[PDB]
Amino acid sequence: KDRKHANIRRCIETFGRHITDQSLERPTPPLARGVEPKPQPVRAGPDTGSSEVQIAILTSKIRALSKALEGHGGNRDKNNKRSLRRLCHKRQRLLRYMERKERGSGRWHHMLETLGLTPATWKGQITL
Amino acid sequence: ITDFTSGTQHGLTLKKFQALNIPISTPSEIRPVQRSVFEADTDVTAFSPDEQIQEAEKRWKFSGPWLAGMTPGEFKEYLAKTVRPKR
Amino acid sequence: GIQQITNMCSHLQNASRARLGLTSLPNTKYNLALALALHRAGFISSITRGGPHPPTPEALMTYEPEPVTSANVATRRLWVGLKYWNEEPVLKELKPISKPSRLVTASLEQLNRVARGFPAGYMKGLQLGECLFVNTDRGVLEVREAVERKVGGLVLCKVK
Amino acid sequence: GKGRIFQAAKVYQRASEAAATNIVSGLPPRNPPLWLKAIESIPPAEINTRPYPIQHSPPNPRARKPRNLFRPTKIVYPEDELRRDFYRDHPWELARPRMIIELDGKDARFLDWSKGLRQRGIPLSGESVVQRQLWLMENQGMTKQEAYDKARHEFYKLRQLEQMERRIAVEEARMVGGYFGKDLLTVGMELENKTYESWKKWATTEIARQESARASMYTNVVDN
Amino acid sequence: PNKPIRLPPLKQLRVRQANKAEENPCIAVMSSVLACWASAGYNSAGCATVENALRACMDAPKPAPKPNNTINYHLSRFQERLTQGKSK
Amino acid sequence: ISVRRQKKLKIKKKKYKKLMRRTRNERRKQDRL
RNA sequence: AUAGAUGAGUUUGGUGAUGGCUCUGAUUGAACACU
RNA sequence: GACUAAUUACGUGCCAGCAGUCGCGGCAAUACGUAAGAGACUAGUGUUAAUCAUCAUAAAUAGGUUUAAAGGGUACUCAGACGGAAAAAUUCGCCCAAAUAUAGGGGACAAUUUUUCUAGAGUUUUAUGUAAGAAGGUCGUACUCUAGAGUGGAGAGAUAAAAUUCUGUGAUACCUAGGGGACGGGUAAAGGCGAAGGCAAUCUUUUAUGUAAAAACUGACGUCGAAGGACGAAGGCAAAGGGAACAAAAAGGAUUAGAUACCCCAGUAGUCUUUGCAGACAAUUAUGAAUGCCAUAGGUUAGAUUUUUAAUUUAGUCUAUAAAUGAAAGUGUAAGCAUUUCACCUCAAGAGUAAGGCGGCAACGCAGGAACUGAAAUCACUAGACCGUUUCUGACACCAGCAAU
RNA sequence: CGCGGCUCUGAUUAGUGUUAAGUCGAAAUACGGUUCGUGUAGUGGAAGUUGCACGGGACUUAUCAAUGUUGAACAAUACGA
RNA sequence: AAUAUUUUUGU
Ligand SMILES: [K+]
Ligand SMILES: [K+]
Ligand SMILES: [K+]
Ligand SMILES: [K+]
Ligand SMILES: [K+]
Ligand SMILES: [K+]
Ligand SMILES: [K+]
Ligand SMILES: [K+]
Ligand SMILES: [Mg+2]
Ligand SMILES: [Mg+2]
Ligand SMILES: [Mg+2]
Ligand SMILES: [Mg+2]
Ligand SMILES: [Mg+2]
Ligand SMILES: [Mg+2]
Ligand SMILES: [Mg+2]
Ligand SMILES: [Mg+2]
Ligand SMILES: [Mg+2]
Ligand SMILES: [Mg+2]
Ligand SMILES: [Mg+2]
Ligand SMILES: [Mg+2]
Ligand SMILES: [Mg+2]
Ligand SMILES: [Mg+2]
Ligand SMILES: [Mg+2]
Ligand SMILES: [Mg+2]
Ligand SMILES: [Mg+2]
Ligand SMILES: [Mg+2]
Ligand SMILES: [Mg+2]
Ligand SMILES: [Mg+2]
Ligand SMILES: [Mg+2]
Ligand SMILES: [Mg+2]
Ligand SMILES: [Mg+2]
Ligand SMILES: [Mg+2]
Ligand SMILES: [Mg+2]
Ligand SMILES: [Mg+2]
Ligand SMILES: [Mg+2]
Ligand SMILES: [Mg+2]
Ligand SMILES: [Mg+2]
Ligand SMILES: [Mg+2]
Ligand SMILES: [Mg+2]
Ligand SMILES: [Mg+2]
Ligand SMILES: [Mg+2]
Ligand SMILES: [Mg+2]
Ligand SMILES: [Mg+2]
Ligand SMILES: [Mg+2]
Ligand SMILES: [Mg+2]
Ligand SMILES: [Mg+2]
Ligand SMILES: [Mg+2]
Ligand SMILES: [Mg+2]
Ligand SMILES: [Mg+2]
Ligand SMILES: [Mg+2]
Ligand SMILES: [Mg+2]
Ligand SMILES: [Mg+2]
Ligand SMILES: [Mg+2]
Ligand SMILES: [Mg+2]
Ligand SMILES: [Mg+2]
């Protein structure tokens, strides 16, 4: 549990939109036709709700659980088989939304290559 | 129904005590010195930040609790919810 | 969407059924449209938007609401004044017609028939006291207003 | 549905229609009830309509979905906080009986709290101190504690004289041949005797009763 | 610990046996007689004083019935007020 | 469904369960399991 | 096309429901029986 | 005969016959067969068959599923339906408005799309609380086995009563010392936890939701969800362990008219562990999931705030009510007012059956008719009667006594 | 000519419907005289019955050993069922 | 307080 909340601090420090707005070259999606960029108010705190941070936090829970189900006696834990299916499906709905919302922005590619999220994680149907 | 009860248990007990014709004096530690309670020096509740400790001995109505009296749990609640948010 | 008007129809019934003086509704462009039609028809007393608490009843009409910006739009609400007369509510029934699953659109030739107590399409004739509200280009009018303006549109609900 | 259809508010509408025409068609309607014209112009009031009750305190502004919007609110005044402070510092002030039975309701007409604690119509009690404190605290711009001390000391000087009168008034009456009845101290003790005696009867009866239980535990019926 | 609940609506709030049931006193004296015979014996002398008490009991007249208790009447006055109501 | 009517279904399912046992071997000879 | 919307018998010790069946209305490129 | 407009007499006697439905006929039948009268249609009149309507009786308009036919065992989820706020582009959907209308007008709503917004749904800040789940280990009361040629020396256990049975090869009872398996006392509550199934000794390790309070963050990312896949009580199959206790089977002793039974002496699978199959349950709240909304009171669970005494308040759960709703019983955080979406129902019986097929080692499961026979099946309530049903009230009803048969 | 489908028929054999008047028991409805049903696995001429877990459509059908009080004297022009 | 023999049938 200590690593759980320590990793949550790493995800916010790596994929936090307040840190990637300057570490990346083109984080935001490309502007649309007729749309002009305007200044927006500054954030009053760390970005912890963006789909990037959430997808990373779900990747940390999927590894801790999937690793516990593959360990000794992990097959006997038939009640957490649903917990894993709910983390992969919850992550599928954020990747399916962030895909069309980010329109292929650099901030969207930094999350895939860093976490290794391939199309099999959100594109089709996840059947475990 | 109006839940009532006879009040003579305390109503007449006050009339009995007042029939003894004795005042109330500050406690004395064991030269008897019976000092009255209602006096401008001791019987005072209003104060100012100028009065030092030498005048705090006269007051009788304090805002803070008595530490030695509070229980270990009542003391924790005081330290955390009344003292800690005052630094 | 039409789901909001359906919730508004049910709530206004539950409020009248409970004999409540005031009633709150979510502040939306669609709800204000039908509310003005009910008020213009004579079913509700007044419409004033305010915070989560009802305005001062003594100065309801004189109430001066604050501007609606993004800092308070999530808390605004439409406060409607219900009517009760002769030991009977004036807005007893608010049966809807166009539901989220199906939107019913009526023509001018059909509203002219429904306005005189004759069925037409998925609607029924209007009897004494009944009333039908239609959402058209000229706003949320009454079947007799839309018939006068010679327009059709989307049927919202039937009021008794 | 345990209730019944009460149409008490429509007795006129119903009686007015039943008296408009005659059951025997072809004849004029008979005279209506004598009460139909008396309340002709006095309709009933609107009942069963929940309004927004009077708010005796600023309602919670931070609530986004507030409940109990049709619930009467509690009536709290600035004096409630002063009454609790005084009567807690003077608990035995509650033993002094106080009548809450009004005579004609016109008691607050002669109360001028700029004069002092002693007012017309009301007795000198913890309320006079509260009303005097609230005046000084508001008009004279005194603090809660400052006004409390001033109004509290005036209360003591008046109570002291009351206790001194009882002592001197009795001592003064005996110096001229004035005798009195049984004081409260003596009457109180006599009552305890009658009760203590009744307890003694209950103690001796139960004590003897327990002896039988102690002897009945063991068995000695053989009479060895 | 929780406090006593508010009883549901009942048909009648009453106690079955209002007035206590008096136990025959001589039945207790007989038990003492049967105790002597068990330990001492039947044709013995230790049960003399106990057997005599059993004869004197059955000879004495039984007490008179006590006045009935009026508890059930007062329970019926405060039923709807103490409980949730009356059901029928 | 009442209990009286449930007992009607109880007798039907039992007589069938009891029949499929008696004719189990016969249905095995003819390859009708 | 603005007059066009209808019921009845029958389960029960009985009441109220549910749910069938039957009759009431119109008709046939009809058949049969008596005419 | 009634439905259905229109009556008597005689004969017949559950026979002969009548009948669309309910029904009629057992020796004084308005119902059968004659005679007369009466009611009606008319060159037509009846009957049979068929179709529509009756039937909201497959309900798109326009139904319903707590107890009457009918809610799937579960919810994560692909497709698919449905789903906020304030603006804009496009379609010109929708409307004028047709005649399958050229070309336009109106802009509320609708479809695709764009920009913003925070009320929905989510994330962070170790919450508290908690028998969800899993791994590796242990603890204890009782039980049982072995030994101490223990103490003691004739009974014990069983049942309503007994018998089979145990014991002189020393039992039961009372101890000592070694083991051996599974169980979970109190705490404990209308309490709580999980999608459900279900989860209650204890330590360490391990795992996903959820709830309260404030702030911050993302900015409609939402709900439902055929199918597939996963999970799924007890019992069961397969393999290897374990085996104290309980106990289908098999077996014996009693009870009884008979007794496979209920009871008893004993007792194998099985229950437990590990790895698979299996997928049926009163898998229940007889009530799918979810959203919006409707007046109070008394308890209770985990929090929060406070003038922490005692009152507010968020999310649950449980009793009793109002308006209301319902066939009623009753519900009343819903079985109400509405909406979304999936599953399912269309008289009884045959039947959840047959056949072909699919899954499985098997047991069985999924899916799923028709023929034959009917006018009824079915629900809630009301008042009684009954109860090897409770508490009472009368009576030679009984007890007791005497007399008699 | 072969394969597959389809119709009819088949010794023998199974289920179900109907039929007032037969035989054997008495399972359910009351605590139905062993609580009844659901699932599953056995068993018995038959209905039934047995193990295991589960449901109430059965026990909310619940109704005092807290035994129930000298709660401020008395007399007065006060007070007066 | 923890008690429990048996007792079928009715055109
Ligand atoms: K348009
Ligand atoms: K021995
Ligand atoms: K929960
Ligand atoms: K045994
Ligand atoms: K499986
Ligand atoms: K509550
Ligand atoms: K069949
Ligand atoms: K019951
Ligand atoms: Mg296990
Ligand atoms: Mg059913
Ligand atoms: Mg009946
Ligand atoms: Mg019906
Ligand atoms: Mg007639
Ligand atoms: Mg009949
Ligand atoms: Mg005839
Ligand atoms: Mg002709
Ligand atoms: Mg269900
Ligand atoms: Mg299934
Ligand atoms: Mg099922
Ligand atoms: Mg256009
Ligand atoms: Mg934005
Ligand atoms: Mg913001
Ligand atoms: Mg939120
Ligand atoms: Mg914790
Ligand atoms: Mg020996
Ligand atoms: Mg052990
Ligand atoms: Mg359960
Ligand atoms: Mg326990
Ligand atoms: Mg879902
Ligand atoms: Mg599925
Ligand atoms: Mg199993
Ligand atoms: Mg097993
Ligand atoms: Mg085996
Ligand atoms: Mg036997
Ligand atoms: Mg197991
Ligand atoms: Mg279960
Ligand atoms: Mg579902
Ligand atoms: Mg609970
Ligand atoms: Mg309730
Ligand atoms: Mg309803
Ligand atoms: Mg059927
Ligand atoms: Mg099936
Ligand atoms: Mg088959
Ligand atoms: Mg009855
Ligand atoms: Mg006799
Ligand atoms: Mg006799
Ligand atoms: Mg003789
Ligand atoms: Mg043949
Ligand atoms: Mg039985
Ligand atoms: Mg029986
Ligand atoms: Mg039985
Ligand atoms: Mg059973
Ligand atoms: Mg057997
Ligand atoms: Mg029963
Ligand atoms: Mg019979």
Curated annotation (Swiss-Prot), chain D:
The lineage of its organism: Eukaryota, Fungi, Dikarya, Ascomycota, Pezizomycotina. Keywords: Mitochondrion, Ribonucleoprotein, Ribosomal protein. Belongs to the mitochondrion-specific ribosomal protein mS23 family. GO terms for molecular function: structural constituent of ribosome. CDD domains: At1g26750. GO terms for cellular component: mitochondrial small ribosomal subunit. Component of the mitochondrial ribosome (mitoribosome), a dedicated translation machinery responsible for the synthesis of mitochondrial genome-encoded proteins, including at least some of the essential transmembrane subunits of the mitochondrial respiratory chain. The mitoribosomes are attached to the mitochondrial inner membrane and translation products are cotranslationally integrated into the membrane. Component of the mitochondrial small ribosomal subunit (mt-SSU). Mature N.crassa 74S mitochondrial ribosomes consist of a small (37S) and a large (54S) subunit. The 37S small subunit contains a 16S ribosomal RNA (16S mt-rRNA) and 32 different proteins. The 54S large subunit contains a 23S rRNA (23S mt-rRNA) and 42 different proteins. It comes from the Eukaryota. It is found in: Mitochondrion. This is Small ribosomal subunit protein mS23. Its main location: mitochondrion.
Curated annotation (Swiss-Prot), chain F:
Coiled coil: none annotated. It comes from the Eukaryota. It is found in: Mitochondrion. Residues 14-27 have a biased composition (Basic residues). Residues 14-33 are annotated as: Disordered. Component of the mitochondrial small ribosomal subunit (mt-SSU). Mature N.crassa 74S mitochondrial ribosomes consist of a small (37S) and a large (54S) subunit. The 37S small subunit contains a 16S ribosomal RNA (16S mt-rRNA) and 32 different proteins. The 54S large subunit contains a 23S rRNA (23S mt-rRNA) and 42 different proteins. Component of the mitochondrial ribosome (mitoribosome), a dedicated translation machinery responsible for the synthesis of mitochondrial genome-encoded proteins, including at least some of the essential transmembrane subunits of the mitochondrial respiratory chain. The mitoribosomes are attached to the mitochondrial inner membrane and translation products are cotranslationally integrated into the membrane. Belongs to the mitochondrion-specific ribosomal protein mS38 family. This is Small ribosomal subunit protein mS38. The gene is cox24. The chain holds residues 312 to 344 of 344 of the full protein.
